Design an enzyme around this catalytic site. Structure first.
Site, mmCIF file in Angstrom:
data_model
loop_
_atom_site.group_PDB
_atom_site.id
_atom_site.type_symbol
_atom_site.label_atom_id
_atom_site.label_comp_id
_atom_site.label_asym_id
_atom_site.label_seq_id
_atom_site.Cartn_x
_atom_site.Cartn_y
_atom_site.Cartn_z
ATOM 1 N N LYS A 73 -46.884 59.878 40.554
ATOM 2 C CA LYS A 73 -47.978 59.673 41.411
ATOM 3 C C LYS A 73 -49.346 59.647 40.887
ATOM 4 O O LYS A 73 -50.326 59.146 41.375
ATOM 5 C CB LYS A 73 -48.099 60.793 42.484
ATOM 6 N N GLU A 95 -53.572 62.226 52.416
ATOM 7 C CA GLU A 95 -52.770 62.683 53.437
ATOM 8 C C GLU A 95 -51.498 62.914 52.561
ATOM 9 O O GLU A 95 -51.418 62.131 51.491
ATOM 10 C CB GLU A 95 -52.448 61.654 54.321
ATOM 11 N N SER A 302 -38.465 59.733 37.226
ATOM 12 C CA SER A 302 -39.476 60.320 37.566
ATOM 13 C C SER A 302 -39.173 61.718 38.507
ATOM 14 O O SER A 302 -38.117 61.700 39.017
ATOM 15 C CB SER A 302 -40.173 59.357 38.721
#
Lengths: 314, 322
Positions: A73, A95, A302
């Site tokens: 991310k 968010e 990940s």
């Protein structure tokens, strides 16, 4: 020149993004943080025991679990936070649902000296106590949204917040669920994964991989898949738990298959993968034996299966 | 086969010497350091931390970015490979807080070695995460009720001598018998060697100061040793308060300083907020000491902190404290 509506905010961001992508200094700075802070390039690791076990293709693991944060991310958030800095902005709104994008946003805001406001639906806030606590330690303000109280509601409050504080605030979206140019920006920053994988794999085998495997999750694999999208000889396998250009075939892995993959990878490669990754590994465990020995298969890894006690309890 | 510690050690000594001069051994080792462990680790410029202190530039040697999240693997991978070269298929290790244990089990999983890890009872009961990691990786974890790290070291030695025919002891502590301190120091020098090279590339000179944690059997000599001969580089070992090692401190080449829990917790909060890096509490002690040192140094000067471990382990326990 200060925007008053969502449309004007979106247009402002379009122009800023295009300017940045053409400023060599911007890309230079971004690469500097990706190297010395995030830890790129991440290894492409030849999993030779796994390869011997399956009996078919050579199996390689793209180690996105070795990024700072232990997930990918951050590739997106750091690109956008630098863009925010380049726009002269002092705050970021975002968010988050499970918290990964939140933590990833709070992280780069601490790094870059940006104030950080994160919107989260009250339901998610109730069941992500540690992630919320992580975000707050990273200096972020977490707003619990009760307006249902789901992710969709947090998004809407984040958008309204962005617009009404747009003079100094940039919205860092982690999803590709619009509006433009957010999907492009996210795809472009995430592409460092597939771009690295392509370069590293070529240097090793002198060709492109025959197959690439990644978990779908919510869009997760855009970063890995997109750089290979015009290489039609490369089979793309999206994995989900149990675009539409036909480049990606989708597959479902159950909880039990993913558990087996988790155990095998841990015992055979000394790598403890997270649950979503285990779904990817699990599919590759079906795919690899069917491919030839002179062929290669890349799995994107990940998230960390052993980040804390709560996570390893399974 | 050896039947005594003395002979076990001589067998090790000769095997180590040969490995170290085998170019194929250095190639393989570097291969795994690069592609598995992920070296080199970056040397990161902490700009906010630097502005905060108002003194020396502060760099973080990011050992937290290794596979496993710590730097113990640098040593286990070297010795596990040595084991394979000696032709052994089994491994024994001791561990205190579990980092060495996990790094040992990780590399045995990788190289197909059986793994037995001895650990003091008191350490077992309070390292739930690391024990589960070790078991998931396929290691047998033996609780030592004799029940500190010393008792586990002794139990590992006894096991090794008894199984020396097919078992190698991957030691992590540097208080053991020759040639373990030399082997661990050599394998860990990749930290100091990288740091020196990366820093020089950036600054065209050597750091004025290097700060690192010590204790728990650990020496930080992997970070300090490559700088020992550069006398203008100050060397600071930091512990938890509760020409050319013990020599280095006695003659003042290295100095030792203690940091309290409160100082460590403060540095932990600061690094998190200033850099977006959540450090292990142990590592925080070093950050805390660097916070005292940095303001007293000039702006044109530089300081490196060895940063190891991932603080995500400790967030749960810290939240409870706050």
């Amino acid at each position: 020149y200060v925007p008053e509506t969502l449309m004007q905010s979106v247009l402002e961001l379009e122009e800023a993004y295009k300017e940045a992508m053409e400023d060599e200094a911007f890309q230079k700075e971004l690469n500097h943080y990706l190297k010395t802070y995030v830890g790129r390039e991440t290894p492409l690791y030849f999993a030779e025991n796994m390869t011997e076990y399956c009996g078919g293709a050579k199996i390689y693991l793209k180690r996105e679990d070795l990024n700072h944060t232990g997930a990918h991310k951050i590739n997106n958030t750091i690109g956008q936070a630098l863009l925010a800095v380049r726009m002269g902005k002092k705050k970021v709104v975002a968010e988050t649902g499970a918290g990964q994008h939140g933590v990833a946003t709070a992280t780069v805001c601490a790094l870059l000296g940006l104030e950080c406001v994160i919107f989260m639906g009250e339901e998610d806030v109730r069941r992500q106590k540690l992630n919320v606590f992580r975000m707050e330690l990273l200096g972020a303000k977490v707003e619990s949204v009760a307006a249902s109280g789901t992710l969709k509601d947090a998004v809407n409050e984040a958008l309204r917040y962005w617009v009404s504080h747009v003079h100094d605030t940039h919205y860092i979206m982690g999803s590709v669920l619009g509006p433009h140019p957010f999907p492009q920006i996210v795809r472009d920053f995430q592409s460092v994964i597939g771009n690295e994988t392509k370069k590293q794999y070529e240097a090793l085998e002198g060709k492109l991989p025959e197959a690439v495997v990644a978990c779908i999750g919510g869009s997760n694999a855009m970063g890995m898949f997109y750089p290979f999208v015009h290489d039609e000889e490369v089979a793309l396998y999206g994995v989900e738990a149990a675009k539409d250009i036909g480049r990606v075939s989708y597959h479902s892995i159950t909880d039990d298959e993913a558990l087996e993959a988790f155990q095998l990878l841990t015992k055979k490669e000394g790598i403890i993968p997270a649950l979503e990754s285990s779904h990817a590994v699990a599919y590759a465990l079906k795919l690899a034996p069917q491919m030839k020995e002179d062929e290669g298969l890349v799995i994107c890894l990940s998230g960390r299966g052993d980040k804390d006690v709560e996570s390893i309890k399974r």
